[PDB]
Symmetry: none
Subunit: 648 residues, 2 copies
């Protein structure tokens, strides 16, 4: 009906604004902020190469103008933070990231040597004669466009392109130091190059150079560029001089600040070891699990919930290793985003397959995405099955099966999760993992993998929710039940946390639930297309929580009068999630476990330090409140969980 | 000396010429010749007329093998390495797409303007000097330089194939650039291009078809292809059907049929010789250690931390099982990439302790140690792994190395102690059997030499057998001279750079063999005759005061027999290297194939 919806990209840009804000948070240790600057840059790179590109491919066959307008604004904010706060704060703590060329003799002597012995051999000085010689400018790299005037006083300017060899040198170059010195010194690689251009072009007067960067859909030449970003001091004559070979309208050209590709800030060294950066605490264990005779025995006796970064990642692989050398185990089956890197998990699985046990890995990746690693695994006896086009398996489940009679119920352990088991990222992910021996779940997971492995099985699950099967109905039923309850004069409440909410249908149901008097708390960090503070969303509160850990859990709580039901999911509610992929959602059956999740989510909804509420103009508004005691959810959750573990 | 080892490189080229050898074997020898003539020209010529005459006719020998024999032979076995652009449309289409999508974005076309703009030429890299006319009218020439981006792409490009096709098709990377020059220079009639290659600017191998004026626009003129040592990289479509460099990896069938590897080692010492055997035992043993409840800790030396390997995944698994896992890496890169940082961070997150070599004492000793749990002030009991090579095999050229796997209580305690010395722990620095560089090693070697000299003075035979990569040190060359005059017989098996001259008053007793074979002989072994009660050493280096090195005695008699057997195969007469009587009626073989036949035989006993 007549329902409002944010555009998804505007909503996305709102998210990256909040990332930029972490950088502006002066209460945070500098390197925390620097990390977020880098993240912001890498996110906007991804957005450009898939999302802006998409809209550019459509406009061949306003959104684009809106993006550009917003990005130009965010860019200005970025440089204000960088020059007015970051660089100054670094100096307050003895770090000098030089933005101009050193005057100090020793530093000069050093860099001149460095340029000569280390940089220069990695250069490729390219004169640009546009119609005469063709040249490529690779994406994700930084290049210097140099303007040259020769011997003759003639106005005619020459132009040259050179590389900043960050494929062979660091972006940031440390300058030698004495303990008596006030600072540690750093220089941009491209700055050093700028300061020595005269040796590269001896027969010219080097007029100026400007940093450029191009993002493109892929690095290729056409057979007979989503972004072209450059230092704003650059005259258009030289722009149209590289456009003289690129056919690039002033639409993709965005003039920006003096340093580009600043996602490399993630590479800026902190010479004060653990200082200048929030120390992440030591990951907790479960005492209960630890004091069982073996891990598999523990899960056989009780369900466990593991909340990671707070708890270790170690339980998945430890369990896998137990299972490897156990006589009782017939098979192990799990999902994996890719098989490309070596991992503990792969190793535990290889051991198991070599121990004769049936080992299957269902991998959600593509046609044209490793080869040696897969063959090593197959040789070990592991089986690897891919999602052939249509449904890609986004589900995050593992399965350990015991030897059982014949027509008996499968017995074993199911592991279900909001993210991947393999920790392989520099950013730390907050995620939630259920470990259960429950015979209904274990059977459902059992059945799921047979279905994914193409075997005949009835499309029917006891407790599990699978996408393109029972999940759509279940989500509708659950929401509807809250609507009904309000009409019976009972409380109607929902607590919903995910990375993204974008699906028009589910959003419309939510609006109808609000209209019906159902109260809704949404905790959504990324894209949200539901628009808050509206008549149709009058009973909805929208919280975006962004902090050091990536809030990646997907969790659903339906009040149901007071017989609360909690689900853990692999899916956000996008269009592609509820229809294209195979996903999972799982009921948390154990009451104390369900209670914990709600406790945690309540901690999140109580956050007054990082949490932001969204308004109808897509603004990130901090939920700060001096009157109440300060609570930041990522600190508090750790204290809560550590608390309970001392109560063993 | 130099005339003799230029005639050593003659003997390699001789093998390549050998028309009864399998094509890819011949191709690998040509490849060895090209890498050897190179090394010469950095360590010998840079350090002149007498060189040129004999080299330039070898260069003529080489190219004759290559063009007249190697190329058609491949064709005859259904391998088509083209020297020209394809006429076949499918191929023509492919390379054109390949050029645009893969090669072009990796290109840096630079017009050469010699005094206006300065530019560097990287050594070891192949470039294309390109000669341009902007129009056929001009008569004069523009010039340009082009990279051949073999750092991002292979030197030989395979063209797509149908099972029905007669051949496998390959093209040189630079030739594809040659054919597509006009996309790079649309404004010119692209007159020519020539392969160039520099050494350092001491040398300048280049395409002989190149004029000197363009040479002056920036010197040993050769054929149409430079850096032909790349011919090793050229793949063999037919598994191991046309080579000998990859026979079936051997298993230790005894160890294979023990109830576990850890059980096996616990009961007997084992030797593992690589290419010959599987590389898997170390990884598989490490995994057994990772799942085992008995294992208390795992220590290991590493060169760098760079590759995320099977071994890393294992140690991670061990650390996550709660075991102490420390890793001793000797070099940290200066211009640190994030992939190093990421891998190391993941390992740190997993429980693994990265400990970098504390100054001076870089560990070069490539060892591992698996420790069990033991009662009180008990002796450390476990497994120790000591090797001649690096634990992480990420090689292009194939190295042969030897690994001891022992649970011997003396060595295990010795390796234990060594790690604690590397872990900066104050320790009673006294090793029972092991010999450690800035500790007992120099004294011990000296005695070992002085016991043979002693034995000569006692009327008994004095004998040493040493296998080495090379021997530079003056003090020890003279130490070997000291033993030589004092009546001690000496065998030197070496490969690379060595300056000890034979055939003199101080070297009548020093014979020096240099093997002519495919794998890089990396083992470093010391054999002391000791009046017939023989002593053998596995060693991490060759002759002692800079880093920390290890020499390990081979205590087990049968393993000592084994190594001596191997070494002696490398010393026999029917094997290719360089009063008595025999005839010219036995077919010479290669040491490595003989060694393989030997180790295979041993296993099926």
């Amino acid at each position: 009906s007549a329902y409002p919806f944010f555009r998804r990209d505007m909503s996305w840009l709102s998210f990256n604004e909040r990332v930029l804000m972490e950088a502006a948070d002066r209460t945070l240790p500098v390197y925390d902020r620097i990390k977020f600057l880098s993240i912001f840059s890498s996110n906007l790179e991804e957005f450009y190469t898939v999302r802006v590109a998409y809209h550019q491919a459509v406009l061949q066959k306003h959104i684009l103008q809106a993006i550009r307008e917003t990005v130009i604004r965010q860019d200005e904010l970025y440089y204000r933070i960088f020059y007015d706060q970051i660089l100054p704060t670094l100096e307050e703590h003895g770090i000098r990231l030089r933005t101009h060329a050193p005057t100090h003799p020793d530093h000069k002597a050093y860099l001149r040597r460095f340029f000569h012995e280390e940089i220069f051999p990695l250069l490729y000085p390219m004169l640009l004669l546009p119609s005469k010689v063709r040249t490529f400018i690779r994406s994700g790299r930084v290049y210097l466009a140099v303007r040259l005037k020769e011997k003759e006083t003639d106005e005619a300017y020459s132009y040259a392109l050179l590389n900043v060899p960050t494929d062979g040198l660091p972006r940031f170059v440390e300058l030698p130091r004495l303990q008596t010195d006030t600072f540690y010194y750093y220089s941009f690689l491209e700055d050093i190059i700028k300061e020595h251009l005269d040796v590269v072009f001896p027969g010219y007067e080097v007029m100026d150079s400007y940093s450029i960067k191009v993002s493109r859909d892929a690095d290729l030449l056409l057979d007979a560029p989503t972004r072209f970003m450059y230092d704003g001091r650059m005259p258009d004559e030289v722009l149209r001089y590289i456009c003289s070979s690129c056919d690039i309208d002033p639409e993709e050209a965005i003039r920006s600040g003096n340093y580009v590709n600043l996602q490399d800030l993630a590479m800026l060294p902190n010479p004060f070891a653990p200082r200048l950066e929030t120390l992440t605490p030591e990951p907790l264990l479960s005492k209960h699990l630890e004091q069982a005779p073996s891990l598999m025995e523990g899960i056989r006796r009780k369900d466990y919930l593991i909340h990671v970064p707070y708890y270790t990642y170690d339980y998945v692989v430890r369990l896998l290793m137990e299972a490897a050398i156990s006589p009782d185990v017939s098979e192990i089956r799990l999902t994996q985003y890719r098989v490309a890197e070596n991992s503990s998990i792969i190793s535990a699985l290889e051991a198991a397959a070599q121990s004769g046990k049936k080992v299957s890995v269902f991998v959600e990746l593509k046609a044209r995405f490793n080869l040696r690693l897969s063959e090593r695994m197959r040789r070990s006896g592991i089986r690897i099955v891919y999602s052939m086009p249509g449904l890609k398996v986004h589900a995050k489940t593992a399965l350990i099966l015991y030897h059982t009679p014949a027509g008996e119920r499968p017995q074993g352990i199911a592991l279900l999760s909001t993210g991947n088991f393999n920790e392989t990222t520099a950013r730390i992910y907050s995620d939630t993992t259920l470990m259960t021996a429950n015979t209904d779940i274990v059977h459902d997971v059992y059945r799921l993998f047979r279905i994914l492995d193409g075997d005949p099985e009835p499309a029917r699950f006891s407790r599990l929710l699978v996408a393109r099967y029972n999940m759509g109905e279940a989500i509708t039923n659950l929401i509807e039940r809250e609507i009904e309850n309000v009409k019976r004069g009972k409380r109607g409440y929902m607590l919903l946390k995910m990375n993204g909410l974008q699906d028009k249908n589910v959003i419309t149901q939510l609006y109808r639930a609000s209209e019906a008097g159902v109260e809704i708390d949404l905790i959504v960090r990324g894209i949200c297309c539901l628009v808050p503070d509206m008549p149709q969303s009058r009973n909805i509160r929208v919280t975006r929580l962004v902090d050091m850990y990536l809030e990646h859990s997907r969790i659903w709580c339906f009040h149901n009068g007071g017989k609360e039901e909690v689900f853990i999911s692999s899916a956000d509610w996008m269009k592609r999630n509820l229809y294209n992929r195979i996903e999972t959602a799982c009921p948390v059956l154990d009451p104390t476990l369900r209670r914990e999740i709600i406790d945690i989510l309540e901690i999140q909804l109580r956050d007054n330090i990082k949490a932001c509420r969204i308004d109808s103009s897509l603004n990130n508004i901090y939920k700060h409140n001096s009157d109440e005691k300060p609570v930041r959810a990522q600190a508090a959750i750790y204290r809560y969980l550590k608390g309970k573990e001392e109560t063993t």
